[PDB]
Design a protein around this ligand. Structure first.
Ligand code: HEM
Length: 445
């Protein structure tokens, strides 16, 4: 795996406090290509660069192109991905949402790519934007942008709902040293043209990845109040019972401890330990896999997005089922922290959420499949009792309706909750993140 040529955000992330997603159109291909090769290609951060703390740049930069952006560059080659070529807007109905609610810019194919800028101060990002806009002139044209930031203090690495994020990623066979329980996949699941990618790619695209971007707004005070109002009756404090309902929706406590390994109370020591916090398969040698929801509901978020033993394979860790449906996640929260006024009124006023970023070699096997065939599927996982699992309580969608989620209450795996959406999609786009060599090579030719 030629790490020198792979853009850093695909495999390790930017590792910076601030990020800017700068969505652009290409107006003058000739001038754009000139500065793409002379000004962008030399500064693109690779996996090798961002892997070592020594060689981290002041401003990490990555760049990806939509289908219409590649066309605008004169690239007519088949990348091998029908979903990429049609654009995420024509795919919205697969997720039971409407482009009528999207950010107007995403509701089309006018966006030609995204520059990802990453740095520890927003001042440095603002400088690089000016620099990029002044050298490209009008050949590049900003259509939309989204500023994002790691959350402050001890909430750093947590997403807006409070849960530690970035724990579970596929390990790439031959690249990562796998952690206990982590799926182990061929490189070609993430990296186009890499080991065991079955789709033929253009040679200049070998070493890239498809980037699925989603702007996902989170209603954090609403979510916090739903947990208190629907907390399961029981022993501990009401807050503790509320946290337990939230942990059952996600499949992890806010510390990162998986409920499958500690189903009744948090354990922050476990949540922080990468040698233990993923060492599970959902199988429990004394319980029936098809009906036991006392450790983790069938509808829990992580269980719907990585089913592990719900799809067969080893009942003891590591489970390796459905390695081809793995995605690498490089998202980052956006918006202000929740304010006093919102916290006291249980109502959001300031838009916040997650800039969702998923990398995969095949969009039909990754983000799109996870969203439509698993999370939005009331009968997935299969073979359960009761068979109606319900929807993913975090990301599950059903055309704006509240979503029926089963198995969340520990006292009764048949009790249903009708849960309003706490995550609201404002849309996004499918991009191709090319290998660095293509940026000043084919894409600049
Ligand atoms: C605002 C929206 C979302 C929130 C708040 C959220 C939250 C989380 C959290 C807290 C975790 C556990 C931390 C971890 O495992 O690293 C997680 C894991 C995961 N999420 Fe989400 N997520 C969101 C959107 C999505 C979407 C749209 C998808 C895919 C369609 C997705 C796929 C996954 C996957 C694949 C995992 C890893 C599961 C595993 O390997 O066990 N997430 N997410």
């Amino acid at each position: 795996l030629n790490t020198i040529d792979i853009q850093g955000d695909i495999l390790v992330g930017m590792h910076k406090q601030k990020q800017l997603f700068y969505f652009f159109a290409i107006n003058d291909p000739a001038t754009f290509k000139t500065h793409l090769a002379s000004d962008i290609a030399p500064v693109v951060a690779s996996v090798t660069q961002l892997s070592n703390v020594a060689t981290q740049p002041l401003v990490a930069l990555n760049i990806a192109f939509s289908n219409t952006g590649l066309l605008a560059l004169g690239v007519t080659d088949n990348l091998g991905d029908s979903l990429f070529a049609n654009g995420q807007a024509k795919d919205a109905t697969s997720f039971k949402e409407s482009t009528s609610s999207w950010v107007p810019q995403f509701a089309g194919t006018g966006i030609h790519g995204v520059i990802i800028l990453a740095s520890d101060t927003t001042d440095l990002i603002d400088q690089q934007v000016a620099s990029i806009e002044s050298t490209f002139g009008s050949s590049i044209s900003k259509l939309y942008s989204l500023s994002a930031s790691i959350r402050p203090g001890n909430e750093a690495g947590h997403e807006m709902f409070g849960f530690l994020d970035g724990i579970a990623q596929p390990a790439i066979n031959g690249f990562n040293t796998p952690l206990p329980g982590q799926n182990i996949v061929d490189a070609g699941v993430i990296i186009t043209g890499a080991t065991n990618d079955p789709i033929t790619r253009p040679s200049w695209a070998v070493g890239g990845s498809f980037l699925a971007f989603r702007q996902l707004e989170q209603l954090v005070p609403e979510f916090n109040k739903y947990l208190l109002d629907n907390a399961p009756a029981g022993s501990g404090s009401l807050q503790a019972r509320a946290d337990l309902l939230g942990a059952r929706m996600v499949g992890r406590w806010k510390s990162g401890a998986p409920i499958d390994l500690t189903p009744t109370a948090d354990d922050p020591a476990l949540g922080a330990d990468a040698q233990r916090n993923n060492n599970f398969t959902y199988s429990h040698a004394g319980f029936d896999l098809g009906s036991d929801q006392s450790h983790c509901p069938f509808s829990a978020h992580i269980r719907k997005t990585r089913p592990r033993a719900d799809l067969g394979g080893s009942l003891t860790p590591p489970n390796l089922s459905a390695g081809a449906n793995s995605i690498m996640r490089s998202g980052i929260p956006y918006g202000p922290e929740v304010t006093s006024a919102e916290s006291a009124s249980n109502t959001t006023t300031q838009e916040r959420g997650g800039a969702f970023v998923a990398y995969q070699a095949q969009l039909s096997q990754g983000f799109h499949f996870l969203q439509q065939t698993w999370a939005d599927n009331a009968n997935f996982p299969p073979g359960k009792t009761p068979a109606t699992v319900g929807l993913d309580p975090i990301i599950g969608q059903n055309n704006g309706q509240p979503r029926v989620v089963n198995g969340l209450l520990p006292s009764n795996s048949s009790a249903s909750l009708s849960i309003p959406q706490f995550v609201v999609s404002h849309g996004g786009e499918y991009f191709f993140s090319p290998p660095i060599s293509a940026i000043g090579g084919r894409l600049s030719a």
